[PDB]
Amino acid sequence: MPVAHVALPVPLPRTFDYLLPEGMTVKAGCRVRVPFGKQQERIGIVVSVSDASELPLNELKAVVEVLDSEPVFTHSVWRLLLWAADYYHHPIGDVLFHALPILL
Amino acid sequence: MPVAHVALPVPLPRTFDYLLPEGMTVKAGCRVRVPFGKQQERIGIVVSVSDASELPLNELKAVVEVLDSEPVFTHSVWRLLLWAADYYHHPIGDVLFHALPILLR
């Protein structure tokens, strides 16, 4: 066939990049709505807020709305969840999203 | 301000899509050399091959080379590796490349 789905020994934090809007300030631990490929919206969690992107800041999928002004995860829980994903080898995303429910 | 690195719920094993040039063929369990970074090389393992990808075929980087005529892992071992990665929520690449040295050695 044409497409090979390959497994790589990829880094630890495999996330996606989205341009933060003007006057729209958000920090890590807060849920946000971002477009997902050829399509419409889908919720996600901000892990980092850098000022550099792997791709041009021109052809970079922008953001939409900030569902939280204050991180749903505490510095405490956050330190703990990121530690669990690293120590026990679980994707950050999976640990974060599967933890949110139990938290609430 | 610019980029906000976001984590999104993703399909079971998060894999990387590559294009297989005309004439090139591979089967699950086989290692391949693939581009990584604007100009680097890296070793990966084919988990599965289908006729579709999130992005259009022409946007996929091509596999550079296949390193295995046949699977490097045993059939059973292979099915168990994919199973454990899904069941215990471990990155498939993490599992596959850590077990390789254990199993072959």
From Swiss-Prot, chain A:
Q: Outline the inducing conditions.
A: Induced by hydroxyurea.
Tell me which domain of life the UniProt entry assigns to the organism this sequence originates from: Bacteria
Q: Where is this region: 3'BD?
A: 1-99
User: Effect of gene disruption?
Assistant: Cells are filamentous and grow slowly with low viability, chromosomes can be fragmented, partitions nucleoids poorly, increased sensitivity to UV light and mitomycin C, does not allow phage phiX1874 replication. Loss of inducible stable DNA replication (iSDR, seen in SOS-induced cells), and constitutive stable DNA replication (cSDR, seen in rnhA mutants); neither type of DNA replication requires protein synthesis, DnaA or oriC. ColE1-type plasmids are not replicated. Defective in homologous recombination, hypersensitive to mitomycin C and gamma rays.
Query: What parts of the sequence cross the membrane?
Result: none
Q: Provide the domain comment.
A: Contains an N-terminal DNA-binding domain and a C-terminal helicase domain with a number of subdomains, all of which contact ss- or dsDNA. In a PriA-PriB-replication fork structure, movement of the PriA Cys-rich region (CRR) creates a pore through which the ss-lagging DNA passes, and exposes a surface to which PriB binds. The N-terminus (residues 1-181) recognizes the 3'-end of the leading strand in stalled replication forks.
Q: What does this protein do?
A: Initiates the restart of stalled replication forks, which reloads the DnaB replicative helicase on sites other than the origin of replication. Recognizes abandoned replication forks and remodels them to uncover a loading site for DnaB. Serves as the scaffold for primosome assembly. There are several restart pathways, the PriA-PriB pathway is the major replication restart pathway. The PriA-PriB pathway is subdivided into 2 distinct pathways. The PriA-PriC pathway is a minor restart pathway. Recognizes and binds the arrested nascent DNA chain at stalled replication forks.
Family membership noted in the UniProt record: Belongs to the helicase family. PriA subfamily.
Q: How does it assemble?
A: Binds ssDNA as a monomer. Binds to replication forks, subsequently PriB then DnaT bind in a 'hand-off' mechanism, which allows DnaC to load helicase DnaB onto the fork. Forms a branched DNA-PriA-PriB complex when the lagging strand is single-stranded (ss)DNA. Component of the replication restart primosome, which is composed of PriA, PriB, PriC, DnaB and DnaT; DnaG primase associates transiently with this complex. There may be 2 PriA subunits per (pre)primosome. Interacts with single-stranded binding protein (SSB). Interacts with PriB; binding is improved in the presence of ssDNA.
Q: What is the name listed in the Swiss-Prot or TrEMBL entry for this protein?
A: Replication restart protein PriA
Q: Which organism is it from?
A: Escherichia coli (strain K12)
Specify the taxonomic lineage: Bacteria, Pseudomonadati, Pseudomonadota, Gammaproteobacteria, Enterobacterales
Question: Gene encoding this polypeptide?
Answer: priA
According to the record, which residues of the full protein are present here? 1 to 104 of 732
